[PDB]
Amino acid sequence: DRVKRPMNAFIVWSRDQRRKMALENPRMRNSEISKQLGYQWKMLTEAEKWPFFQEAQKLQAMHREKYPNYKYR
DNA sequence: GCACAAAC
DNA sequence: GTTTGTGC
């Protein structure tokens, strides 16, 4: 049925990026950290792209090559 | 448009 | 309460 899927390049930010928001703002009332990241997307910081994108490339490549024609259902 | 993952 | 990326 469902194939396994590693973290998405988007949740990757969540992992480390969010840790930054948790330091100075460990108490967010509403879901602001959500619409806030949207602002970062219209202005992606290269300091965060190049670093983890190189790895995220092969993660997808391996599992992808194991399920070529297998698609969501 | 549908299906999945994580954490505040 | 919610965001987004990937594939057709």
Curated annotation (Swiss-Prot):
Impact when changing K71R: Does not abolish acetylation
A GO cellular component entry from the record: nucleoplasm
GO-annotated molecular function: calmodulin binding; DNA binding; DNA-binding transcription activator activity, RNA polymerase II-specific; DNA-binding transcription factor activity, RNA polymerase II-specific; DNA-binding transcription factor binding; RNA polymerase II cis-regulatory region sequence-specific DNA binding
Effect on the protein of changing R18N: Strongly reduces nuclear localization. Abolishes DNA-binding. Does not reduce interaction with KPNB1 and CAML
Presence of the UniProt keyword Glycoprotein in the record: no
Residue span of region Sufficient for interaction with EP300: 50-73
Result of changing K58R: Does not abolish acetylation activity
GO biological process, one term: sex differentiation
The record's account of how the chain is modified after translation: Phosphorylated on serine residues by PKA. Phosphorylation by PKA enhances its DNA-binding activity and stimulates transcription repression. Deacetylated by HDAC3.
Effect of K66R: Does not abolish acetylation
Outcome of substituting R19P: Reduces nuclear localization. Reduces DNA-binding. Does not reduce interaction with KPNB1 and CAML. Does not affectnuclear import
Transcription regulation found in the keyword field: yes
Region (Required for nuclear localization): 4-20
Taxonomy, superkingdom: Eukaryota
Associated disease: 46,XY sex reversal 1: A condition characterized by male-to-female sex reversal in the presence of a normal 46,XY karyotype. Patients manifest rapid and early degeneration of their gonads, which are present in the adult as 'streak gonads', consisting mainly of fibrous tissue and variable amounts of ovarian stroma. As a result these patients do not develop secondary sexual characteristics at puberty. The external genitalia in these subjects are completely female, and Muellerian structures are normal. A 45,X chromosomal aberration involving SRY is found in Turner syndrome, a disease characterized by gonadal dysgenesis with short stature, 'streak gonads', variable abnormalities such as webbing of the neck, cubitus valgus, cardiac defects, low posterior hair line. The phenotype is female.
Domain notes: DNA binding and bending properties of the HMG domains of human and mouse SRY differ form each other. Human SRY shows more extensive minor groove contacts with DNA and a lower specificity of sequence recognition than mouse SRY.
Function per UniProt: Transcriptional regulator that controls a genetic switch in male development. It is necessary and sufficient for initiating male sex determination by directing the development of supporting cell precursors (pre-Sertoli cells) as Sertoli rather than granulosa cells. Involved in different aspects of gene regulation including promoter activation or repression. Binds to the DNA consensus sequence 5'-[AT]AACAA[AT]-3'. SRY HMG box recognizes DNA by partial intercalation in the minor groove and promotes DNA bending. Also involved in pre-mRNA splicing.
Family that this chain belongs to: Belongs to the SRY family.
Protein name per the record: Sex-determining region Y protein
Organism: Homo sapiens (Human)
Encoding gene, per UniProt annotation: SRY
Residues of the full protein shown: 58 to 130 of 204
